[PDB]
Design an enzyme around this catalytic site. Structure first.
Site, PDB file in Angstrom:
ATOM      1  N   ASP A  79      -6.833   5.948  -4.854  1.00  0.00           N
ATOM      2  CA  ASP A  79      -6.381   4.570  -5.036  1.00  0.00           C
ATOM      3  C   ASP A  79      -6.461   4.172  -6.512  1.00  0.00           C
ATOM      4  O   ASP A  79      -6.776   4.982  -7.393  1.00  0.00           O
ATOM      5  CB  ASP A  79      -7.109   3.622  -4.085  1.00  0.00           C
ATOM      6  N   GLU A  92       0.796  -1.223   0.000  1.00  0.00           N
ATOM      7  CA  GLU A  92       0.000   0.000   0.000  1.00  0.00           C
ATOM      8  C   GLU A  92       0.829   1.275   0.000  1.00  0.00           C
ATOM      9  O   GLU A  92       0.314   2.320  -0.402  1.00  0.00           O
ATOM     10  CB  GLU A  92      -0.950   0.028   1.208  1.00  0.00           C
TER      11      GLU A  92
END
Ligand SMILES: Cc1ccc(I)cc1
Ligand SMILES: [Ca+2]
Length: 164
Positions: free
Chosen positions: A20, A11
């Protein structure tokens, strides 16, 4: 490693609101804020999550605390789910990290279509599960991350993360 190191690699860490891979407002170590297109809506979610007025920016300590909460929520969602818990409890510790990783990324609803993969994993048919896991929107949209997670299920080792 452990689940925290694994997801931190997958991440990254960003202290300001970002999008994202699906275009959704996110912050920290992959903390989804909202699917709304409104940045103000994302900022409100952030302030609620942190407990102060952030105007879109957090500290590293705050990012790490959010991350701990998010990992715990993924684990507890697995353990409360009658479909996921038996598979999770059948796995060794490294493969359990791969399972948490998928739930962190996709949620319980995102993994609902993996029923055949789950059965193969519970049967310990690792190569067959790896092939089946790759036949997914998940693999096609985030192939490098999916390959690392799949390699973890296939081998039961951290080799994909050490190699990276
Ligand atoms: C895709 C997936 C979901 C839950 C578990 I437990 C393992 C794999
Ligand atoms: Ca990827």
């Amino acid at each position: 490693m452990n689940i925290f190191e694994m997801l931190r690699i997958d991440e990254g860490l960003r202290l300001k609101i970002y999008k994202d891979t699906e275009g959704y407002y996110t912050i920290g170590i992959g903390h989804l804020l909202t699917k709304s297109p409104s940045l103000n809506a994302a900022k409100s979610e952030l302030d609620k999550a942190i407990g102060r007025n952030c105007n879109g920016v957090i500290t590293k300590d705050e990012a790490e605390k959010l991350f701990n909460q998010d990992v715990d929520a993924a684990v507890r969602g697995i353990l409360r789910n009658a479909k996921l818990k038996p598979v999770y409890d059948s796995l060794d510790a490294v493969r359990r990290c791969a399972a948490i990783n998928m739930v962190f990324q996709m949620g319980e609803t995102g993994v609902a279509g993996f029923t055949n993969s789950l059965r193969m994993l519970q049967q310990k048919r690792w190569d067959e599960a790896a092939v089946n896991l790759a036949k997914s929107r998940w693999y096609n949209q985030t192939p490098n991350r999916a390959k690392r997670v799949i390699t973890t299920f296939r081998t039961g080792t951290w080799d994909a993360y050490k190699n990276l």
